[PDB]
Design an enzyme around this catalytic site. Structure first.
Site, mmCIF file in Angstrom:
data_model
loop_
_atom_site.group_PDB
_atom_site.id
_atom_site.type_symbol
_atom_site.label_atom_id
_atom_site.label_comp_id
_atom_site.label_asym_id
_atom_site.label_seq_id
_atom_site.Cartn_x
_atom_site.Cartn_y
_atom_site.Cartn_z
ATOM 1 N N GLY B 12 54.196 32.672 27.184
ATOM 2 C CA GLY B 12 53.356 33.479 26.366
ATOM 3 C C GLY B 12 52.153 33.407 26.891
ATOM 4 N N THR B 14 47.924 34.621 27.775
ATOM 5 C CA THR B 14 47.415 35.802 28.267
ATOM 6 C C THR B 14 48.361 36.585 29.264
ATOM 7 O OG1 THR B 14 46.226 34.941 29.836
ATOM 8 C CG2 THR B 14 44.953 35.302 27.766
ATOM 9 N N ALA B 15 49.050 35.634 30.408
ATOM 10 C CA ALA B 15 49.878 36.379 31.075
ATOM 11 C C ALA B 15 51.126 37.095 30.703
ATOM 12 C CB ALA B 15 50.073 35.149 32.206
ATOM 13 N N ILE B 44 41.578 23.761 21.643
ATOM 14 C CA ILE B 44 40.499 23.934 21.402
ATOM 15 C C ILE B 44 40.026 25.344 22.497
ATOM 16 C CG2 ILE B 44 39.562 22.138 20.185
ATOM 17 C CD1 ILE B 44 38.223 21.284 22.992
ATOM 18 N N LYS B 78 29.113 39.438 29.427
ATOM 19 C CA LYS B 78 29.010 39.158 30.711
ATOM 20 C C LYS B 78 28.307 39.850 31.888
ATOM 21 C CE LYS B 78 31.298 36.731 34.683
ATOM 22 N NZ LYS B 78 32.581 36.272 35.309
ATOM 23 N N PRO B 110 25.848 39.227 40.198
ATOM 24 C CA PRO B 110 26.148 40.374 39.282
ATOM 25 C C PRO B 110 26.953 41.495 39.798
ATOM 26 C CG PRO B 110 23.930 40.378 40.069
ATOM 27 C CD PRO B 110 24.660 39.902 41.147
ATOM 28 N N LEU B 348 49.485 31.699 36.336
ATOM 29 C CA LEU B 348 49.590 30.484 37.038
ATOM 30 C C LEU B 348 50.889 30.253 37.673
ATOM 31 C CD1 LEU B 348 46.764 30.180 35.732
ATOM 32 C CD2 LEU B 348 47.752 28.043 34.498
ATOM 33 N N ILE B 361 42.129 36.396 34.923
ATOM 34 C CA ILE B 361 42.781 37.733 34.312
ATOM 35 C C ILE B 361 42.907 38.630 35.377
ATOM 36 C CG2 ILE B 361 42.225 39.432 32.564
ATOM 37 C CD1 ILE B 361 43.069 36.541 31.194
ATOM 38 N N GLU B 460 38.861 49.842 43.628
ATOM 39 C CA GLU B 460 38.497 48.287 43.676
ATOM 40 C C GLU B 460 39.339 47.613 44.368
ATOM 41 O OE1 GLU B 460 37.895 47.142 39.611
ATOM 42 O OE2 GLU B 460 36.942 45.312 40.392
HETATM 43 N N1 LIG Z 1 35.129 43.927 42.086
HETATM 44 C C1 LIG Z 1 34.097 43.010 41.450
HETATM 45 C C2 LIG Z 1 33.270 42.386 42.351
HETATM 46 C C3 LIG Z 1 32.115 41.454 41.697
HETATM 47 C C4 LIG Z 1 30.778 41.680 41.790
HETATM 48 N N2 LIG Z 1 30.345 40.559 41.189
HETATM 49 C C5 LIG Z 1 31.214 39.752 40.623
HETATM 50 C C6 LIG Z 1 30.974 38.467 39.757
HETATM 51 C C7 LIG Z 1 32.097 37.861 39.387
HETATM 52 BR BR1 LIG Z 1 31.932 36.284 38.432
HETATM 53 C C8 LIG Z 1 33.329 38.364 39.670
HETATM 54 C C9 LIG Z 1 33.535 39.667 40.385
HETATM 55 C C10 LIG Z 1 32.254 40.232 40.920
HETATM 56 C C11 LIG Z 1 33.345 43.820 40.370
HETATM 57 O O1 LIG Z 1 32.619 44.725 40.747
HETATM 58 O O2 LIG Z 1 33.457 43.881 39.101
#
Ligand SMILES: N[C@@H](Cc1c[nH]c2cc(Br)ccc12)C(=O)O
Ligand SMILES: N[C@@H](Cc1c[nH]c2cc(Br)ccc12)C(=O)O
Ligand SMILES: N[C@@H](Cc1c[nH]c2cc(Br)ccc12)C(=O)O
Ligand SMILES: N[C@@H](Cc1c[nH]c2cc(Br)ccc12)C(=O)O
Ligand SMILES: N[C@@H](Cc1c[nH]c2cc(Br)ccc12)C(=O)O
Lengths: 528, 528
Positions: B12, B14-15, B44, B78, B110, B348, B361, B460
């Site tokens: 089971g 997530t995967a 946890i 995030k 980012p 995994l 993920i 992507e």
């Molecule tokens: N293909 C990814 C590339 C990427 C840019 N910043 C990231 C930061 C993390 Br943590 C992981 C992946 C990315 C995206 O743009 O969501």
């Protein structure tokens, strides 16, 4: 200041003046640009074909409207290349023969990207129906509304210039070169030197420092672009870079061509290029306003010049003794490196394939596009030069393999030429693609819409021959997958979704055949 | 009917339940799906991070609204991963140290794609200014408006849920699995068998025909998905497929983790994941509502379990004798082949790297996405399996090299762990990219807009680590090009155009820092 100050371009023509015009804009008048072009006797225009990105990537970049340059070069419209008689045996004829199943031996290679349903291209839904006997339509007529438009010789634009489909251009290459020469000289401060080059002077490190002209003048420069054609006066003679002959992939190496008057008012104008199969090669037909250019590409290992000229003449019913013909012997392959030290080869001086899929102008633009991106300073970083060379050789080898697939999978075996193509070896990359295609999987799946694809050159350059193109050629020649895409057997809802897409292709073609003007009528309005 | 009729998923988490839920939709209820999940004692929740494509590519595909599943898993937002103290020597500390040049030892990675001017990414205009001393701004703050938003801990959406920037998610993995289990069982007719597997039954050719459970029940199937984790009960034990250990690129192999209560009202909630460098590895911090998950990834060749647990506890001021810890020993690498005969490994059981860049993920979704695309019938075409395996190994090796660059170009050499990373060798593919980057050229240039990039997964997947990502890590760690992109010296108008782009990044950041709500306030509204 370690920048290049002067760029010297050897040779005119399309390659030389596309380079001069493009670099004039890309370098923003920070560099002096000189073109050394030997004056030559103007030959008759045998016609050139292009791909849709030429306007967006090149002319729009120069700020030249599409209608402006089309009127100065007798330009026409191209929606595809049409292959005629590539599957049935016999002598060369402009009329298509009949296949074993009764269909006419024609198939198209149009532009654009295929729609998808559940992330699966329409081509795969067609193949599933065709392999199961659920459809009798050919791939091009089922998946492209352009096929119905071309069969009716309708224009790709309405009279009010609203776009109906994607399209490229037919033109006289010498008139395009003359147009760009006037543009680059009057509007971009490019210096035109009408003289012949006699000697190339190099320094101790092997870099070109100057060219001597026939008149005694010395042309100094920092970067030199070889646009001298097949002779490769800079890249091959001066720099001694070897040319990699690739005749073991493509057997054709000669051509005889001319221009034929055409009654456009009576017969109309075909909005496409025709590839008419011959006994020892094929013949192109590039229609323009008032005339079409035609040339028989052949291999001299299987036909002499007279044999090819007679078969070419019989094709159009020409008098071989009272017709102006041009004979050309070309090399097929590429230099080991397109850029060596301070010498960049562009066009025929760099590489060449037969114009079976309109590679010529595209090869020129892609090189000058990559040159501006990799433009050096006077240190000439080896990594810049290497990355440029890498992009050129990958671009060329990819198209070379694509062209070889045209001959290798042709079912013709009637003449020694067509038989000899089956003894050549396929590249590993095209073998891999065929293996993928035969499993029912997509080959080079498009990941963008048409807006991104044709609006950004880098997007098309990373995926030039997409899934639609491989299906056009493979299925056009009779090469089908072993079985449908196995995932389709679990997706009845997606199959139904694609049925609506097939209905839209029929609906679009039928509606446009009614409302679109003829190609002849749009040309008269454009050139009026 | 030669189709797969039953798919049995071992394991089971997530995967397993992402596979069951996704295949439930992709196969359109033409295939019975069974999940064999051993009941386990709930551990946890130490936190998981994701990438922005998860909502569009997975949850939207299943028709699950974003707010619905976020509320059932205490999900947070995030906008990047933030690296802390990866350039300075010393003990583990949540507070960043100061570099020799005065900068604080933090840099961001980012999401999103960088804008371009004259087809040149903004990163190259920044590098030219930084190398010439015309700017002292770091790369991330100059080219990403997200950096200013993250420094103020503002939310990626307004209170009325208007999007302000790109973002991904933090969540509890066990609650996500429970959510997907309930979805697949109640809404997709997936059969859940809560038992342990005791036997793997194979035919003469080695294909799995059934699994026996601890209770004696036999589960027959035609295709089997191994989601059993590091043990690889099907792909490694039963099918005997070797695992390629890649510890010669990444030294970490253990982890100690827990969940820490957090005063959100006092400190606020950070809209990003923190990677806090340690003496023998690094520690993640994954903030959620009311608590953050944290885990110290380390190499047991350089720190014992007690040593790593004490440093981990000292980081957050925890009592090591009165704190609930989870200890894991993991393998780094991938199977020789992810898919062998009728056994597909996902998660995994297939491959693993440390979660330094949230690969977990993403690796799962890419596998289940490629499985639906390459889904077979009972003949199991060798080409389908080969193309799938090819995509998995390229995906993994590419991310593996990217992660090694974090350690290889870290200027830290103070402890035996950090010194030992400098003894490893880079793979040839990442060496090539470094060479290209050091010449000033772009690496993996984006060819699409963000809409296509995040809207179509195939776009992507063909360009996952783009030019922006390599600049985030290389320049963040102090690795700069040898010189600016030489073409910029000829393009003064393009330099001015990019100056407007830099001004827009400043304008957006300043305006949004004022008007955006705090991450804490958006979470309070979301989970209210
Ligand atoms: N293909 C990814 C590339 C990427 C840019 N910043 C990231 C930061 C993390 Br943590 C992981 C992946 C990315 C995206 O743009 O969501
Ligand atoms: N030695 C050069 C010709 C040459 C004579 N004088 C020069 C002076 C310079 Br500066 C560069 C080249 C030459 C050659 O063989 O091409
Ligand atoms: N003026 C040249 C160098 C040069 C000096 N004497 C020459 C003589 C010849 Br012939 C060619 C080049 C030069 C330069 O700056 O590149
Ligand atoms: N990248 C090319 C692919 C292509 C499709 N049909 C073609 C026909 C010819 Br002739 C040449 C290229 C193509 C384009 O769509 O413009
Ligand atoms: N331990 C070996 C291998 C090695 C190569 N480059 C290194 C750099 C560092 Br810092 C530490 C060790 C090595 C040595 O000391 O040379």
């Amino acid at each position: 200041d370690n920048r290049i100050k002067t760029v010297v371009i050897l040779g005119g023509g399309t390659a030389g003046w596309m380079t001069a015009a493009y670099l004039g804009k890309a370098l923003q008048n920070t560099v002096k640009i000189v073109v050394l072009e030997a004056p030559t006797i103007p030959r008759i225009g045998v016609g050139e074909a292009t791909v849709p990105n030429l306007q967006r990537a090149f002319f729009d970049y120069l700020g030249i409207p599409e209608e402006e340059w089309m009127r100065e070069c007798n330009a026409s419209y191209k929606m595809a290349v049409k292959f005629i008689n590539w599957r049935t045996p016999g002598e060369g004829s402009p009329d298509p023969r009949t296949l074993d199943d009764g269909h006419t031996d024609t198939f198209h290679h149009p532009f654009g990207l295929l729609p998808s349903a559940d992330q699966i291209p329409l081509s795969h839904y067609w193949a599933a129906k065709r392999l199961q006997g659920e459809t009798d339509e050919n791939f091009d007529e089922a998946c492209f509304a352009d096929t119905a438009i071309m069969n009716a010789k309708k224009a790709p634009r309405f009279l009010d210039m609203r776009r109906a489909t994607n399209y490229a251009w037919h033109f006289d290459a010498s008139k395009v070169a003359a147009f760009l020469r006037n543009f680059a000289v009057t509007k971009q401060a490019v210096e035109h030197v009408e003289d012949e080059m006699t000697e190339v002077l190099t320094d101790e490190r092997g870099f070109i420092t100057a060219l001597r002209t026939k008149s005694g003048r010395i042309l100094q420069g920092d970067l030199f672009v070889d646009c001298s054609g097949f002779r490769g006066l800079l890249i091959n003679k001066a720099m001694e870079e070897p040319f990699i002959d690739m005749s073991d992939h493509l057997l054709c190496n000669s051509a005889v061509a001319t221009a034929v008057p055409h009654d456009d008012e009576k017969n109309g104008v075909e909005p496409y290029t025709s590839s008419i199969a011959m006994e020892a090669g094929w013949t192109w037909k590039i229609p323009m306003l008032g005339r079409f250019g035609s040339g028989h590409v052949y291999s001299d290992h299987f036909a002499t010049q007279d044999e090819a000229t007679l078969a070419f003449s019989k094709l159009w019913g020409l008098d071989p003794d009272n017709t102006e013909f041009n004979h050309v012997r070309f090399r097929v392959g590429r230099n080991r490196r397109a850029w060596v030290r301070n010498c960049v080869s562009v066009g025929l001086a760099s590489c060449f394939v037969e114009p079976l899929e309109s590679s010529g102008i595209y090869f020129i633009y892609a090189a000058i596009h990559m040159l501006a991106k990799h433009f050096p300073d006077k240190t000439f970083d080896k990594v810049l030069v290497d990355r440029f060379n890498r992009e050129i050789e990958e671009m060329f080898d990819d198209t070379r393999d694509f062209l070889q697939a045209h001959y290798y999978f042709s079912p013709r075996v009637d003449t020694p030429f067509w038989r000899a193509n089956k003894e050549l070896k396929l590249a590993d990359s095209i073998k891999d693609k065929v293996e993928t295609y035969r499993a029912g999987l997509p080959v080079n799946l498009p990941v963008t819409d048409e807006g991104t694809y044709y609006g950004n050159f880098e997007a098309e350059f990373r995926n030039f021959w997409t899934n639609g193109s491989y299906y056009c050629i493979f299925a056009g020649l009779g090469l089908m997958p072993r079985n449908p895409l196995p995932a389709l057997a679990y997706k009845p809802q997606s199959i139904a979704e694609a049925e609506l897409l097939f209905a839209d292709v029929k609906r679009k073609g039928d509606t446009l055949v009614e409302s679109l003007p003829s190609t002849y009528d749009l040309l008269r309005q454009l050139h009026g």
